[PDB]
Amino acid sequence: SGFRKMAFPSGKVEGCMVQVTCGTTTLNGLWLDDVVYCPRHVICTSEDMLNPNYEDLLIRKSNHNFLVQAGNVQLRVIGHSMQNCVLKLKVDTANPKTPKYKFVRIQPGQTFSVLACYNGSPSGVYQCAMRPNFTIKGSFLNGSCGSVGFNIDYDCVSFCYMHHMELPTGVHAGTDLEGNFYGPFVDRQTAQAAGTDTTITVNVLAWLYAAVINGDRWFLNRFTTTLNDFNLVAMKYNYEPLTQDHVDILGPLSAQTGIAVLDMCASLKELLQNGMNGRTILGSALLEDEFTPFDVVRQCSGVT
Amino acid sequence: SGFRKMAFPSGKVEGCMVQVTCGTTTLNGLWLDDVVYCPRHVICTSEDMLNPNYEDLLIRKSNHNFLVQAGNVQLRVIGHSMQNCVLKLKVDTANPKTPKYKFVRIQPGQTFSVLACYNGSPSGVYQCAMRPNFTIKGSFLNGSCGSVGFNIDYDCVSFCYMHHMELPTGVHAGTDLEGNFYGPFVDRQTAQAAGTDTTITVNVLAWLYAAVINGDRWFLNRFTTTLNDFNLVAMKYNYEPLTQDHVDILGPLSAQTGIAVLDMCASLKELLQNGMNGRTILGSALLEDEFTPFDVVRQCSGVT
Numbered sequence: 001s002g003f004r005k006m007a008f009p010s011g012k013v014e015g016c017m018v019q020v021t022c023g024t025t026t027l028n029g030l031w032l033d034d035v036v037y038c039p040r041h042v043i044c045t046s047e048d049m050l051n052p053n054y055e056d057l058l059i060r061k062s063n064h065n066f067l068v069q070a071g072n073v074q075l076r077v078i079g080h081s082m083q084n085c086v087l088k089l090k091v092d093t094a095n096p097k098t099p100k101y102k103f104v105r106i107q108p109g110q111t112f113s114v115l116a117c118y119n120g121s122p123s124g125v126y127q128c129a130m131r132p133n134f135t136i137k138g139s140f141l142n143g144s145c146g147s148v149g150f151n152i153d154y155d156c157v158s159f160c161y162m163h164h165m166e167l168p169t170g171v172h173a174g175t176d177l178e179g180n181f182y183g184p185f186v187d188r189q190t191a192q193a194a195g196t197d198t199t200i201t202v203n204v205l206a207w208l209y210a211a212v213i214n215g216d217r218w219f220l221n222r223f224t225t226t227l228n229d230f231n232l233v234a235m236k237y238n239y240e241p242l243t244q245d246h247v248d249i250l251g252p253l254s255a256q257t258g259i260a261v262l263d264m265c266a267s268l269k270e271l272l273q274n275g276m277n278g279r280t281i282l283g284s285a286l287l288e289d290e291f292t293p294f295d296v297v298r299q300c301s302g303v304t
Numbered sequence: 305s306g307f308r309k310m311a312f313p314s315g316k317v318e319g320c321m322v323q324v325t326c327g328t329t330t331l332n333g334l335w336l337d338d339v340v341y342c343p344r345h346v347i348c349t350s351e352d353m354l355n356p357n358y359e360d361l362l363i364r365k366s367n368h369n370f371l372v373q374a375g376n377v378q379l380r381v382i383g384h385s386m387q388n389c390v391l392k393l394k395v396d397t398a399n400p401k402t403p404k405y406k407f408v409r410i411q412p413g414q415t416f417s418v419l420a421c422y423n424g425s426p427s428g429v430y431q432c433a434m435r436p437n438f439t440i441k442g443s444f445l446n447g448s449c450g451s452v453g454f455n456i457d458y459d460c461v462s463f464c465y466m467h468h469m470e471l472p473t474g475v476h477a478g479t480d481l482e483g484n485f486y487g488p489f490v491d492r493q494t495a496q497a498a499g500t501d502t503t504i505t506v507n508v509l510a511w512l513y514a515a516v517i518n519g520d521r522w523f524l525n526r527f528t529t530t531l532n533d534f535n536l537v538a539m540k541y542n543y544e545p546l547t548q549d550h551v552d553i554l555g556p557l558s559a560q561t562g563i564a565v566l567d568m569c570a571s572l573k574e575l576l577q578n579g580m581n582g583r584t585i586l587g588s589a590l591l592e593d594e595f596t597p598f599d600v601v602r603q604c605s606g607v608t
């Protein structure tokens with residue numbers, strides 16, 4: 001019993017975080033095998049941050065320009081290349097602590113653990129979701145860029161996020177580890193605004209199923225509904241359209257609670273139309289949408 | 305910028321979790337040096353769980369009765385002793401991964417990271433607080449007992465909590481690692497109820513300071529107040545009395561925001577008396593009290 005925002009164990013990832021310094025800017029890098037990954041804006045000075053030419057900046061630069069430290073260990077740079085918005089530093093030493101790892105590009109609504117780091121040193125771990133506008137509401141201070149988001153599947157670490165920047169909004173944008181930004185963000189000091197943030201409807205339903213599983217079931221109504229009828233009310237409150245994919249994915253939770261997906265959709269409709277009236281669900285006065293159906297299954301099943 | 309429920313990196317602790325089996329019951333144990341710590345109710349059968357005599361149950365038991373596994377590694381038990389509600393198993397092999405560790409008994413309101421485990425295998429990490437009634441609202445399924453709560457100070461792991469039981473309430477009770485329960489809980493299947501849970505006032509103030517630091521400052525009023533005047537309204541809403549200790553501890557946050565502790569107390573009073581009116585603070589429609597002043601400082605400072 002109980003339901004909490006739960007992050008994956010960070011142990012496998014802790015051993016992969018290095019410090020990358022290039023002149024004045026210092027940030028975090030990911031050391032996997034004989035390659036160190038970090039945001040390419042490590043080569044920028046506050047002069048060039050307004051509209052940098054990264055290809056031209058990287059040309060004015062050789063291996064020994066870049067300083068990599070793993071604690072009290074200095075790594076020799078054997079090569080540098082730019083992959084989109086990510087710098088790849090080839091180093092002499094393979095990381096002895098390199099886990100079985102994949103690079104994955106996650107979809108909006110999917111969740112991952114962030115190991116927040118400063119000077120290649122892990123400070124904390126928290127769970128967060130890829131917002132539909134391809135931002136994340138994370139916790140990053142200066143020097144946090146190069147902090148990575150990841151999932152653990154079996155013994156295999158899926159790296160899905162590398163932190164690059166804060167938008168004047170105060171929310172966060174980053175890349176997959178192939179250096180492609182999530183959303184339409186560029187690595188320059190320019191007027192960038194995220195789109196209308198919608199609510200991840202399939203995640204809220206997952207969270208309501210978690211509430212039912214943990215005895216909190218006051219919001220359960222005596223109605224049902226249809227996808228069409230529901231999606232009309234979803235659009236109204238800036239909720240993501242609910243798909244036949246999403247109903248299928250909620251099947252396990254539906255089966256274990258004996259509450260049909262459409263019945264829970266009717267219960268959600270009433271909450272959107274009538275609010276909570278000072279009531280709480282799993283000790284939240286708001287509807288939570290940063291839990292996937294898989295997050296809820298894991299925590300309500302007991303998956304290692 | 306940004307503010308999240310952040311757990312410590314779990315890496316140092318991941319390497320200390322073993323599986324302890326004694327007959328039918330299997331749970332988690334903590335392997336530090338040549339000692340394995342686990343809840344003593346591993347020696348119980350559902351026969352004796354109603355009113356066990358643990359001294360008499362432990363007497364009907366020798367070293368080879370207890371099965372300890374570190375993955376695919378079976379440890380020889382050289383000794384067993386009972387320390388209050390904790391079993392201590394002396395083993396042949398010292399844990400090579402044992403970190404610098406302390407056992408601390410934390411005070412109500414203090415926070416710690418929980419590494420939730422099943423079969424000595426870490427499943428997830430989350431932050432939680434010692435409630436004033438000495439319970440925690442955690443996330444534990446069957447087989448989670450022996451899961452530990454900890455803080456990281458410098459490179460030193462402070463173990464403060466070992467999970468023992470769920471109360472019919474659905475909240476959790478456990479011990480320090482010297483086997484003394486937090487609160488008045490006993491390790492038997494009996495009608496145990498936690499006391500009136502109060503709100504950790506000093507934590508809510510810390511959280512409001514975090515809100516101000518992250519630009520969310522609509523609730524800031526044009527009044528001030530006194531400890532006495534405030535404590536009268538605190539008692540009314542089941543909030544913990546605010547001490548001259550607590551005001552001193554909030555000093556750093558007061559200094560950095562330029563908001564006197566008593567001004568923030570006046571802002572809190574209005575929220576308690578008038579509610580939020582459908583507004584949010586750091587994206588919560590409720591007042592959060594599971595962040596200490598030190599948690600807020602760490603996350604708003606950048607402490608590794």
Ligand SMILES: *CCS(=O)(=O)N(c1ccc(C(C)(C)C)cc1)[C@@H](C(=O)NC1CCCCC1)c1cccnc1
Nearest residue numbers: 041049140141142143145165166167168187188189
């Ligand atoms: C990653 C931390 S940072 O301090 O390096 N940082 C940052 C500065 C400049 C860039 C460029 C891409 C422009 C070279 C990236 C990242 C800041 C940050 O995002 N600053 C922005 C600049 C635009 C206006 C809003 C602030 C940062 C601060 C806190 C957390 N992450 C990043």
Ligand SMILES: *CCS(=O)(=O)N(c1ccc(C(C)(C)C)cc1)[C@@H](C(=O)NC1CCCCC1)c1cccnc1
Nearest residue numbers: 345353444445446447449469470471472491492493
């Ligand atoms: C620790 C998990 S458990 O399944 O072993 N567990 C538990 C059962 C019995 C005990 C005794 C102390 C009575 C021997 C302790 C722990 C349960 C649990 O707490 N069960 C209680 C029994 C009283 C009535 C409410 C349930 C447990 C379940 C989920 C999470 N933690 C513990």
